Symmetry: D2
């Protein structure tokens, strides 16, 4: 039992935090106010290492483990206010890079992987539909077999990164299968953006497949395998977003601490008033607890143990605590909280899709209950 | 002790609810998506009675009491999704109409009151500044006396309804005093809008006073009286917004109930799953409790009793419950909650300024503690 | 809409509070220490009116409505620390007096009701068994019909007032078929052959309130001692619990009122750091929570009671009241321990025992899940 | 970062859990019913190692670190229902053995420490008074210096283990001036003239754990029986409480682990509506909460203990651990009563008494407000 970062882990965390502070956060205020997703900074961040995860050195990755990745994304969440860019990165990593690295052929990997890992190509994820967003077994997207490939038809909505994406990872009925599709392929129609607020500057839209021919080699994994591949994605997504929010929570705490040590009222800093002080103590309690839960899930995974219930516990706890502390912060700032430059109300806006992405909290409760022997 | 609406009160509630349903809510979806504040519907609503409050028949009011007004605004909050319009109305009523009716001269009243009450003139409220939003005794807005009037100078920010306003109620240092100022008067410069999300389509901006001459008769009440007048405003505001959110909470419950009785999963309506069912039971518990607290505060006032602590309790409870239930609803809808057409995420957006308008929750706690003998 | 007590209600409340303060509370300290249930004070309180409820004047009652009764029991909960005596009274009233008045024949009522209402006879309730405490439809208690009556056999456990009871209201099987119509209600006198009342097992959650188990070994029940018609027991029982739910809620509302006043006093006086500790936002926030809880659930309870007095269906409102009051009483008791610190385990101060006695609120006429189910059903969720 | 027990820690935990299960828990049921504190079992457990902590082998200890000790006491809290015996042991270890080992002279340690560590002598702690329980700087206890020693006078109340104690660690005034330096610590033998130990007053919150009040009437303290230097008492006391905070937290972490396993079993078996009631989302949500709480505060406690073992400053981490564990234990005990229903007040099942015994966690080494103040100060908020 040891509760310090190894020197390697501190190095990973501190380098990533410097990058997020000095490169991404510099003009984050402006890009955010103007709802700009900077592909320039996005690619700088991807090439720095935020798109690597566990991908091996052979494809330009750093062969990081789960705890290592979580530490990078935690630094990212703490150091950069541009959380929409951070979310785009995490999605590209978990929904495309990691599935391709773990389940794709050597041909698919040699053609696409290193470009995704090093940020030459941006990727988007598409498995959610009106009735098929949750139940990703009943889906109105179908890829019928044909000579030397497939014919894909359907409509995927809420596609993170599609307005900027070069490739798309599509899940389609065949069993479900996973396909990589290049932007521009005939019959692939990317649609325009509907205004966003919850992680505002992170682009999303809907894509339409109208008799798209998918080459045989662009299938990821075996036929019918999509459901497992996708499942793997969500685990990683669950972890990375958990890391991101732990980082944001850390940022939120330091900010609130500043506002409390400086703001003078009644002849003393308002942090001596037990209302604000109690909210800060709550933030600190929440952050330390769910930080430890997250590290233990990641570390168990890196040990080869099965970490899926631990990560479910992590996502549950961080979802809840992040929302509650965001409320506490709005209460603590008062009439200075709606400062778009302070970016707190938008912080909570961006934290809204936490229970709206890789499982509501009821799904996590089901995972935990099953692990406990309750069904 | 009696817990039924009198026939008169039911009539007030049901007529207002029909108006909000049939007139205001009809195309609310569209105006909201397009961030449109319809001055047409605004004036229809004002003339219907939503701008009357306690103003006497002599000025076109209906001589309503506090409980009557709360019932109108509750129906309004339940029947119309266009909550930004509802907020504009409440502000016009509480920050301008009611102060003018209760503290203005017969000259000021005869010139302005009936036009405000019947909705021929829209009014905005201005007492909040960077360091003077909270402490409305230390303010960087000053009205120095001069022959036959005053010279006003300053800058008021976050002025609800200023982009659409015909008159402004200004609080200025002299003691503080209250002045009515017509739009366009020389040296009055209304500024353009900064984008909004928390009650989005409700217009706000900042105004600049540069050597404005205020006629003597445009002062409201006595010199130095501003602080009392303003205080009265906030009480009424506290009540009306409380009513509005109780109404929205009622709407939110019925909607969630629908989604739960219809949504079929695992062979049964998802309302038989104790997670969603427990959230609905919570909503119902919250709504009934804070509804009763609100009616009792209003009724105590109508009895001539001092209701200020009761209304503080009401605002506290409704602020908290509205936020919590909005969270519960996001959790209950899941991936259908970010439906801009369903308007739930925007509902919570509009509910954010509840602890950001007529007191944070700490101010209410102070009122209650003082009433209890604790300082 | 009106939030004032009528003068009649105000008198009912103030008179009952004076009685609780001046008669029941006076030596409550000692009786509580020595685990004494005073049958003397029990009978005085019952004859004063706490055993009357809705019973008409012709049987010695005061024809109180539900709201009136709730105001009486609220006064009792606020004015007297002897909460076990209060609970014993509430049980006699809700589980015995009221079923008999509402469902018993004129013969049965003429024989027993005035004695119960005036406190000459104490009554106990018996419908709970190891597996039959909850489902009082699946019951290991049987009263088979026979010539001129019934033969009863079984074992009822956790019987409030059984060691002191003169009569028992028993629920028993009479039509072992299905349907919600196989249990009936009988009144049985103490001492009747085959009835063996047991000795007391140590108690802490309402310590001084006596309870034990009774066993029926071929007891003959005369025909005239059945309460209501055959099979009606299930309805009878249901009604009992509703009245019980309301009265206990009133009692706890009263205790919360008491707890708030005490906590307010201790906060205005106790000086630490040079000022009354109620200026420390921790203690004051705990008091503000107590006040918010008290007012909210007080109004929920009054409205449920008032609805019943209107003839409206009050079952979901009463469920909401019980739910809220259970939760708030537990929470405020915790907050009170937190505010007192090391003076809270003061046996004479009686706070830890106060929360102990508040424990069986979710352990008598439904856990909180039952209330949630009543509400969910009333909402259309099943 | 590593989240596995080393083999040594795993052995320490498993051995202690076996001892708690097989020796202390075996007849815990009966001893609890009859309010018996077994000095026999107390001495066996102390000699096994529960009285050792960090004491070196030369005094009969095992040279455990804070994390090791916390794992032992966690095993004790999980494996033995006799929580009062556990609390008596923790008090002897944290309030007596550890101050003496850390601050006592070689003469004092040579005379007393091995006897305390091996359980030949039971020790009790005395620093609490009516107004001096909290501020153990403002104290109505005085030990004025004199020829070859001190003269002690005063009255200490709420003394854990005083009825059974052979020695007492006393905190007393010696420099009535200001400064945080006017109290000193003394070891005093049972029977010394002027020491009057009192009889037991009935208890429920850790019922079978003996406590009483002691009065000093011109007791002569030999000079060599002062612990540490003069005025050092305030530091000594502070250190005691830190160790106490950690150990009690461990104990409650252990109880929570026990409560979870029991609740899991009762949920996998109890069939209602044709299925195990753990499939009902109310009971399962309560269990999931228990699991979340247990894991979070378990990790907070281990990390505080580990930090201390590193030489880092652990005071705020230990405050956070105590805060979280107090709250979670109360909440989970409530959830457990809610899940059991009418079987929770089962005296042999011991849940209601479990929560009763969990009550003095915020009633011993700080309410929760003290922990919040430690954390706020460490955060820079004063």
């Amino acid at each position: 039992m040891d509760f310090n970062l190894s020197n390697s882990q501190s190095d990973i965390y501190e380098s990533a935090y410097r990058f997020a502070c000095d490169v991404l956060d510099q003009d984050a205020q402006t890009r955010i106010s103007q709802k700009i997703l900077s592909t320039e900074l996005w690619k700088k961040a991807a090439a720095y290492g935020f798109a690597h995860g566990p991908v091996s050195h052979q494809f330009g990755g750093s062969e990081l483990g789960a705890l290592d990745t979580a530490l990078m994304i935690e630094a990212l969440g703490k150091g950069s206010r541009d959380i929409g860019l951070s979310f785009s990165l995490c999605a590209h990593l978990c929904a495309c890079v990691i599935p391709l690295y773990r389940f794709g052929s050597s041909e698919l990997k040699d053609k696409y992987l290193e470009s995704l890992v090093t940020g030459k190509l941006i990727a988007a994820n598409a498995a959610t539909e009106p009735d098929a967003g949750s139940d990703i077994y009943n889906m109105q997207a179908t890829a019928q077999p044909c000579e030397g490939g497939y014919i894909l038809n359907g409509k995927k909505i809420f596609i993170t990164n599609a307005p900027i994406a070069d490739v798309f990872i599509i899940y389609a009925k065949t069993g479900v299968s996973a396909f990589l599709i290049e932007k521009g392929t005939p019959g692939l129609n990317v649609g325009e953006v509907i205004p966003k607020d919850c992680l505002s500057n992170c682009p999303w839209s809907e894509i339409v497949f109208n008799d798209i021919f998918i080459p045989q080699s662009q299938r990821i994994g075996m036929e019918g395998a999509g459901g497992a591949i996708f499942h793997d994605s969500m685990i990683w997504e669950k972890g990375c977003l958990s890391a991101l929010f732990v980082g944001g929570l850390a940022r939120l705490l330091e900010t609130t601490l500043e506002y409390a040590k400086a703001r003078q009222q009644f002849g003393k800093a308002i942090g001596q008033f037990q209302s604000v002080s109690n909210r800060i103590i709550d933030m600190k309690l929440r952050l330390e607890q769910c930080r430890l839960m997250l590290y233990r899930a990641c570390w168990k995974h890196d040990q080869g143990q099965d970490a899926e219930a631990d990560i479910a516990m992590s996502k549950l706890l961080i979802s809840e605590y992040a929302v509650q502390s965001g409320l506490d912060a709005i209460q603590t700032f008062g009439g200075a909280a709606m400062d778009q430059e302070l970016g707190l109300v938008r912080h909570l806006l961006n934290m809204i899709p936490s229970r709206i992405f890789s499982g509501t909290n009821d799904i996590q409760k089901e995972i935990i209950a099953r692990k406990l022997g309750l069904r």
